[PDB]
Amino acid sequence: EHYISLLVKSIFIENMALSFFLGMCTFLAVSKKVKTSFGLGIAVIVVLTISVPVNNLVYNLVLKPDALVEGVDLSFLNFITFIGVIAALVQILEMILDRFFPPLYNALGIFLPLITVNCAIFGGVSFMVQRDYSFAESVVYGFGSGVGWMLAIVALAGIREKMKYSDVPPGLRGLGITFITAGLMALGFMSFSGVQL
Amino acid sequence: MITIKKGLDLPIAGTPSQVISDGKAIKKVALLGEEYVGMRPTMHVRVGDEVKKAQILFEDKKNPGVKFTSPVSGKVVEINRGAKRVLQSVVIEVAGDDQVTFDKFEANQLASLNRDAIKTQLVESGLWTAFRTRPFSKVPAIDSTSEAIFVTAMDTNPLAAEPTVVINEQSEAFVAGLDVLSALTTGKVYVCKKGTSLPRSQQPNVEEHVFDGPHPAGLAGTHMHFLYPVSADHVAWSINYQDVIAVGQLFLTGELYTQRVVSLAGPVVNKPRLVRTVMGASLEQLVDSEIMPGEVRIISGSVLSGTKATGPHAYLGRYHLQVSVLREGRDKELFGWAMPGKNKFSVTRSFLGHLFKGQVYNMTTTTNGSDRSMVPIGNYEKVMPLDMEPTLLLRDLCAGDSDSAVRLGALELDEEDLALCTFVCPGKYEYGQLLRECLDKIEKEG
Amino acid sequence: STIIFGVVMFTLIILALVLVILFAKSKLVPTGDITISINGDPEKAIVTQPGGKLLTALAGAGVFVSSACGGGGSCGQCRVKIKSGGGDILPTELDHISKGEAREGERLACQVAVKADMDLELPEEIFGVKKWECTVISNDNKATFIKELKLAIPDGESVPFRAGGYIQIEAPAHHVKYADFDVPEKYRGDWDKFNLFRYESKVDEPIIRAYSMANYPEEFGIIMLNVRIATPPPNNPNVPPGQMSSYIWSLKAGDKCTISGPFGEFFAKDTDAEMVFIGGGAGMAPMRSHIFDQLKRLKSKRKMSYWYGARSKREMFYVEDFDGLAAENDNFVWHCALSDPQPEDNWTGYTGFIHNVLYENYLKDHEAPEDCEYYMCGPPMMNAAVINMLKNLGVEEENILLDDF
Amino acid sequence: SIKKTLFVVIALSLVCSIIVSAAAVGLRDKQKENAALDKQSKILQVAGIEAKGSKQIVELFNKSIEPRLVDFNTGDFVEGDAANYDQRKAAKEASESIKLTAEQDKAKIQRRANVGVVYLVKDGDKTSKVILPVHGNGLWSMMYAFVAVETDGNTVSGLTYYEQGETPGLGGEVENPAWRAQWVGKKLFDENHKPAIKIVKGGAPQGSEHGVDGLSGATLTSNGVQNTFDFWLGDMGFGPFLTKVRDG
Amino acid sequence: KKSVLAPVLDNNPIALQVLGVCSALAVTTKLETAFVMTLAVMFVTALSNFFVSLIRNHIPNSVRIIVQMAIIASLVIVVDQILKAYLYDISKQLSVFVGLIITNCIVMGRAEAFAMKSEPIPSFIDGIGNGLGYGFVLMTVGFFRELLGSGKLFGLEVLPLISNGGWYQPNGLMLLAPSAFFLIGFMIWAIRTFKPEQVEA
Amino acid sequence: WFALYEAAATLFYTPGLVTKRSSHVRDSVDLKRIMIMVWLAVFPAMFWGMYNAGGQAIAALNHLYSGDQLAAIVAGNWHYWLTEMLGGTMSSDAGWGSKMLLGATYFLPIYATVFIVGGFWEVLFCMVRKHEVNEGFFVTSILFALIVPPTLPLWQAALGITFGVVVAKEVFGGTGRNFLNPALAGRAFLFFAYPAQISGDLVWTAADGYSGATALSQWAQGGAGALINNATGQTITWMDAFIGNIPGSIGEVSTLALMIGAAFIVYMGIASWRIIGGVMIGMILLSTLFNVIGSDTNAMFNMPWHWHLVLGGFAFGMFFMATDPVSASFTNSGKWAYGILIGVMCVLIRVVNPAYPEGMMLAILFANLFAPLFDHVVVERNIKRRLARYGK
Ligand SMILES: Cc1cc2nc3c(=O)[nH]c(=O)nc-3n(C[C@H](O)[C@H](O)[C@H](O)COP(=O)(O)OP(=O)(O)OC[C@H]3O[C@@H](n4cnc5c(N)ncnc54)[C@H](O)[C@@H]3O)c2cc1C
Ligand SMILES: CCCCCCCCCCCCO[C@@H]1O[C@H](CO)[C@@H](O[C@H]2O[C@H](CO)[C@@H](O)[C@H](O)[C@H]2O)[C@H](O)[C@H]1O
Ligand SMILES: Cc1cc2nc3c(=O)[nH]c(=O)nc-3n(C[C@H](O)[C@H](O)[C@H](O)CO)c2cc1C
Ligand code: FES
Ligand code: FES
Ligand SMILES: [K+]
Ligand code: NA
């Protein structure tokens, strides 16, 4: 249905990492091993899949113009609520994992401190506000965008591992070459540019 | 029983004759220090000393209790060292017949001998150096034990001797050696041979496995992967059939057996054949008046994985049962990389040579190119029958990634296992040394 | 109007977020004081609230872990055996811990963060520390930049230590001017060449450093030690002067300082192989104890060799002791090479750096340099030169022990 | 000390929120004026009235432009807050919008608002030309433009694309003044009162009544522009309204 | 001065550190947006550091992260109101990244690493320097992307375009995502070949 | 200047180097031969492409201009009257020789500038970094020069190759050390940097003032029935596209020439038949799927697999661009997945991406990013077997 189109839109057609430059710091930082990048990707999906729908409810119930009281709009308290809600949920998820899910805490709870108020989460939430997404639409977009982000970080991590045999000139070693690698990744991901799916 | 499909049987011209004949009289023998992995010699003799057939020549500091005995009785005429005072060789000039003796047992009682009695006798005589732990190709520690001893009764190396011919003359010794190995091993003994019949051991521990296919089928590393996979905590021992014969002779007569049969072969060998010689026999004297004129390279062991026989190293190796002599291909040709390869051999089908099936090539030592970055065109996957990803593993070795190389199976590999991967590399790498450097790093940090 | 609505919503939102966090903290973060078993002894067991680093928790109890870089995980002197707990080894720890050590359980106490119950197998030296406030007896200058410090035990008996050990001396914040230092007239002239007295040191905060002992175990009552003064590099004057070595130099007879027990992993091998000691600067301290240990404490008959790299005759000290030991016992022989003899020295022996003199005199014609224990000690420049020479001679790293200062 | 933690956050939240609320409520009118001015300038530009500076733009816009609300179904003026109407918001709500069928949705727009906004340009006390907001999907993103139609209801006085996401050089040429200046003089309809504007690929004939040169190497965007006009000039667009203009 | 200029070339937030790269790849298409973004980042980082340092001692560790987020978020909102009220067109060009300055890693990194354990005055100077260095990366990339991507600087035609009867054909890649990565990637190379101390082993 | 001189000396004469250790005998195959076999494998496509480009141009010129008008055009362009001075004729009666000659005047400058500019960056990096010049650039130059429109400006080619050689290859260490396809990286730079000169209807034929759509673009507009060549007004049949008598980039039009060239290297083992097999499976499966689903509005849905094969640069990309060993996956299982992704991605861009008429390049560039992952997935499965001792 329309949902499947949205999920593909959030992964391939609209990629948070490369097509919006969101979460690049954590995308160019833990992009050294596939496993650790895999761990961040799944953690970002969890945060996005729980941040976007929760933020959608609050916006449509509180911050939506002419929602609580006629003639008054609380849209100006948008960033505070989104950044505040995101930070609360990520911390809450981390603590419950460290208390009830030991193995998940090491697998996922380790990276949540990194995802705390991350550009990928806020951007995905903000773009939801810029559009008109229902609760069902918001959750799919949240899961979809996170999966699309996980796709870019894992793909970059795989390339960086393949680059173990490369001879990067000094100065380009480390960060410098990673930028060029990310740019080349963006060039390939532009294949889905003009697709209205 | 097990058939190997991937592999490269080098059709190098000048194969042996599979006939055992007396070699040139050898008046010089040596022990090669570099031949043993992780061996720091503690010299027990000095130049001018008089040794016997089994007197200790030096010990291993990093493997205490391992004694390297003199192959023959004579005078230590030189101790060749090199950069970092690395013990290149210890040369003995054969003069005399005095020899140490050890306990001797009837063939019937060999299987029932105590494990410790077997270990001490092997260590005392120096035959313990025949064994090699696969994970690192080091002589096993005295106190250590393994649940799988692999006896390599097949020789698929190019220009290699036929083990059946050699073993048939020493049938009793081989069976005796197997019985001793059966008692020594904690688990089973794998006799990896070909389809041809060989003497068999009645002990239930000894098992015969038949391997068929191109060259890689004949290596102990290949056998271990298919039969007893090795890892950090799964260690197996390797021993060639000739050494097993020596073990049987040692426990039958109580005297160290040093006679060996090696295939003196190669393009420049006038009459390639199997020749009876002694351990560490001076290849310079062995190939005397048996090579065509010109600049040639004498190699101990297969051309795929052998040692250059020049200067201090011009002596048969401990684990080498073959001598290959090759021409030196230093000539430069105009557009030699563009001509159609009527007389060129390659695993790929980009030369006319592969069209003429059954051809034999007068190979030389030329690299057939310069050193270049690895460009994987599928050559490696065509010569590695093990369940590994060779191209990715070779990239890890080139990059020096010890951690990843171990995960991909670098521990299960020996320098010889990568000889074909070195042979077919378009970039002209030497993966044997890269694997050795990687394995050393694992041991040191481990 | 809308201003009121925004303010109340803002306050409600922040309160909602913190309250769920605080409520989650109580019901998800068990504050049960983590109990760490030290050596398995119930009395040694320490109970501490969750948080902090294992180094702080251990220091609170009677167990003291030697630490130099502090809570950075940079030196590796605080290695501990964590039988259980603490999670996987951090990547930063592995830079100073080999994989084999990780398998055994070696971990840096400072680097590891305490978050759960753990089991520890700390050694005796960490388990128990002989913290004493010894009294300074003598502080005469042995050489141009070397001072011999004699310490009086405050509790009687003697410090339990092995040959080649060291003591972690602790000092508080203090200001010391180099003019306060007292030097002999012989070494005063060399100081007057540049007049190093102008330097002034101001230690703003307490510091902790290590100093190798110079007394053999059989010596009881006085703890001989050698201290090198820390000064700014000659090519880098813009550096504060020595902070700890300057402070110890300022002291004289009657002063007091803490030793915080002994420590060190420097020792010889209980074997029959030859020993070849080579020292430089402060390195003569551990060497002196080792020679004395092998002559009377053990009365070893193993061949002993000592080579000291010196710049001038004035630098040399303890020479009379070396001559007596060499004369009294032939198994031990000592030599010294001068990199730059003074015109009045009139040296007629070896001249130049030991890195080339030693090979050209002893190692070149020796039958087994590899089969001989080497105890190197001296400035880093000599260590790099000799190690290259020794490596070019074919000596394994396990066969050579180095104690840089 | 929970009491201290509650005090610091409460005091910090109040002062920060008070400043934020004052700025949000205080500056809200300014932001709306800034947003309004952006469209007001473009309407003036297509109308041909030269304005520079916010004071001049607002003054000229009030004196020369009379926004009105038009019902597409009947093409008749309706009473409302034309100056403060948001057509985009209406098209997203079913209350003031309809869902076009596949056959009718020639311009590829999902919804069409029931009532649209038009801007009459009065030189004196009488309208001289009318500006219609026409939008349609291009190759990359929706393209929005203002079309100036003379009192006759057939001639197009000018054109301007005030919002369009297209590749510069290929699809972004719609912003090019020469291509926009080419539309002047063209007749929207024919004698049959049917859409006649055609975007000729490769260049329309010189002097053509309804021929405008298409964007070079950008047929996809040129096709989108043609569809936008072919629809908004049809029955479901400004067709009925334009017919009323022809007779008054 | 040394502290102010330290994060320009010695400790750059984007060359050495990996903070603040989200905006560098987006708002660098034009110099007008990049320059305005630089001022917002400089103003927010400096103001956020000053307030966090002022209340650093009383900050609760339990809610220190939410406390710093609120002050940073509040400052961003006020700047957002200024951008919308004045420079509305620029606010449209910056789109959502104006609100993302809250998550911009420079603001949190300096508000935590330095502001929490420094006096208010030096923390304010540190914030300005960190933004100033982040601006150096922004403007250098923006200068190249706008000049070679459109033949304009700050909206002024520097290279005449063939579309406007000129001579220079704009490079369509400079306006796309990949161009920002390559320019920054080559920027680091240029920075680190003059300052090898930052080369990674 | 040692690096370049050594390459020239080693180029004329094989090195006299001998094995130093390990395998004392080495396989005859070397990188120098591998590149030359690939370089010679595209010769049939290059030679036909020159004939096709000139043949198409001549037909368009005659179809548009005649009499004194044609003569004025010929004298107005250096490509035309240069062909005349060398014995060619621009009239419709021109033989194969003149058609080939005209294409040569359009190809050789593109190949020459690409080689010179690309070579300078190769030698500059090797000289400065004290390496030995690699021969992998010989293949890179020709392939880039065969995936560009005949009318591409020379300066654009210099910029395209510079990006393809420097950013995509040299900064990664050089031949065998990068992950992306250098030639396609250069074309993708031209694709997005200067789309007007590498897209549309004014670039694929060398006839001045001629506007003619290609087979792929025409199919999207009106499906199979929309395939017509305006130069000769003759319907474009499958045989015409398969042979290569259609407008398009020089070297990609003829699928038959590429099949002959690709067959040789695939037989020699230089080019992986698994990648080629993977691409065909991906293209066939997805194209057949779109056929079944149908689309009353999108004509591309009904294009059969065999029409996808002979149209656009699918054949050239599948054979001489997707088989790049360095950028492809290094595992046999991964190569199948890598090839299938290329085939699927190329069909997706062709059908469901109106912006880009063809997507073989973007399909390969997209696949190059995920080639390591297909390796990582395969490797991890192998590692899992190893920890289980392969069930032994
Ligand atoms: C096991 C062990 C045993 C040791 N045994 C001895 C021993 O017997 N004798 C001995 O003298 N040392 C010994 N040391 C070294 C000891 O830790 C000190 O290096 C030494 O005592 C000088 O103390 P310091 O803190 O003043 O040196 P540092 O100040 O740490 O030395 C740094 C150098 O720069 C100068 N400097 C001073 N302050 C600063 C500053 N803030 N920044 C930069 N440079 C500065 C110093 O003058 C010196 O030249 C030993 C170390 C270890 C680990
Ligand atoms: C656009 C089409 C192409 C993109 C779609 C295909 C993507 C395929 C790659 C998926 C991501 C890689 O997925 C990879 O799966 C392997 C299994 O082989 C996991 O393998 C690993 O799993 C666990 C962790 O989860 C480890 O403890 C374990 O040692 C190892 O088996 C890797 O941790 C994961 O990184
Ligand atoms: C079968 C084969 C195909 C190749 N294809 C290409 C190609 O499409 N583009 C290119 O630049 N180099 C190509 N090369 C050369 C080289 O392998 C390539 O540039 C690598 O990416 C260099 O690391 C090819 C080489 C071979 C053997
Ligand atoms: S104190 Fe230095 S490593 Fe712990
Ligand atoms: S600024 Fe760092 S994640 Fe966006
Ligand atoms: K398409
Ligand atoms: Na074709």
Automatic annotation (TrEMBL), chain A:
Its main location: membrane. It is an enzyme of class 7 (translocase). Keywords: Cell inner membrane, Cell membrane, Ion transport, Membrane, NAD, Oxidoreductase, Sodium, Sodium transport, Translocase, Transmembrane, Transmembrane helix, Transport, Ubiquinone. One of its GO terms (cellular component) is Gram-negative-bacterium-type cell wall. InterPro entries: NqrDE/RnfAE, NqrDE/RnfAE_oxidrdctase, NqrE. The keyword Lyase does not apply. It is a multi-pass membrane protein. It is found in: Cell inner membrane; Cell membrane. One of its GO terms (molecular function) is oxidoreductase activity, acting on NAD(P)H, quinone or similar compound as acceptor. Its EC number is 7.2.1.1. GO terms for biological process: respiratory electron transport chain; sodium ion transport. The chain crosses the membrane at residues 11-30, 37-54, 74-93, 105-127, 139-159, 171-192. It catalyses: a ubiquinone + n Na(+)(in) + NADH + H(+) = a ubiquinol + n Na(+)(out) + NAD(+). Belongs to the NqrDE/RnfAE family. Composed of six subunits; NqrA, NqrB, NqrC, NqrD, NqrE and NqrF. NQR complex catalyzes the reduction of ubiquinone-1 to ubiquinol by two successive reactions, coupled with the transport of Na(+) ions from the cytoplasm to the periplasm. NqrA to NqrE are probably involved in the second step, the conversion of ubisemiquinone to ubiquinol. This is Na(+)-translocating NADH-quinone reductase subunit E. It comes from Vibrio cholerae.
From TrEMBL, chain B:
It catalyses: a ubiquinone + n Na(+)(in) + NADH + H(+) = a ubiquinol + n Na(+)(out) + NAD(+). GO terms for molecular function: oxidoreductase activity, acting on NAD(P)H, quinone or similar compound as acceptor. One of its GO terms (biological process) is sodium ion transport. The keyword Isomerase does not apply. Its EC number is 7.2.1.1. Keywords: Ion transport, NAD, Oxidoreductase, Sodium, Sodium transport, Translocase, Transport, Ubiquinone. Residues 114-256 form the NqrA second alpha/beta domain. The keyword Protein transport does not apply. Residues 2-94 form the NqrA N-terminal barrel-sandwich hybrid domain. Residues 261-310 form the Na(+)-translocating NADH-quinone reductase subunit A C-terminal domain. NQR complex catalyzes the reduction of ubiquinone-1 to ubiquinol by two successive reactions, coupled with the transport of Na(+) ions from the cytoplasm to the periplasm. NqrA to NqrE are probably involved in the second step, the conversion of ubisemiquinone to ubiquinol. Belongs to the NqrA family. PANTHER family: NA(+)-TRANSLOCATING NADH-QUINONE REDUCTASE SUBUNIT A. Composed of six subunits; NqrA, NqrB, NqrC, NqrD, NqrE and NqrF. This is Na(+)-translocating NADH-quinone reductase subunit A. It comes from Vibrio cholerae. The gene is nqrA.
Automatic annotation (TrEMBL), chain E:
The gene is nqrD. The lineage of its organism: Bacteria, Pseudomonadati, Pseudomonadota, Gammaproteobacteria, Vibrionales. Its EC number is 7.2.1.1. It holds the Pfam family Rnf-Nqr. It is found in: Cell inner membrane; Cell membrane. Belongs to the NqrDE/RnfAE family. It is an enzyme of class 7 (translocase). Composed of six subunits; NqrA, NqrB, NqrC, NqrD, NqrE and NqrF. The chain crosses the membrane at residues 34-54, 66-88, 94-111, 123-144, 173-191. NQR complex catalyzes the reduction of ubiquinone-1 to ubiquinol by two successive reactions, coupled with the transport of Na(+) ions from the cytoplasm to the periplasm. NqrA to NqrE are probably involved in the second step, the conversion of ubisemiquinone to ubiquinol. PANTHER family: ELECTRON TRANSPORT COMPLEX PROTEIN RNFE, NA(+)-TRANSLOCATING NADH-QUINONE REDUCTASE SUBUNIT D. It is a multi-pass membrane protein. GO terms for biological process: sodium ion transport. This is Na(+)-translocating NADH-quinone reductase subunit D. Its main location: membrane. Coiled coil: none annotated. One of its GO terms (molecular function) is oxidoreductase activity, acting on NAD(P)H, quinone or similar compound as acceptor.
Automatic annotation (TrEMBL), chain F:
It is found in: Cell membrane. Its EC number is 7.2.1.1. InterPro entries: NqrB (IPR010966), NqrB/RnfD (IPR004338). The modification FMN phosphoryl threonine is found at T214. Keywords: Cell inner membrane, Cell membrane, Flavoprotein, FMN, Ion transport, Membrane, NAD, Oxidoreductase, Phosphoprotein, Sodium, Sodium transport, Translocase, Transmembrane, Transmembrane helix, Transport, Ubiquinone. It holds the Pfam family NQR2_RnfD_RnfE. GO terms for biological process: respiratory electron transport chain; sodium ion transport; transmembrane transport. GO terms for cellular component: plasma membrane. It is a multi-pass membrane protein. It catalyses: a ubiquinone + n Na(+)(in) + NADH + H(+) = a ubiquinol + n Na(+)(out) + NAD(+). Its cofactor is FMN. NQR complex catalyzes the reduction of ubiquinone-1 to ubiquinol by two successive reactions, coupled with the transport of Na(+) ions from the cytoplasm to the periplasm. NqrA to NqrE are probably involved in the second step, the conversion of ubisemiquinone to ubiquinol. This is Na(+)-translocating NADH-quinone reductase subunit B.
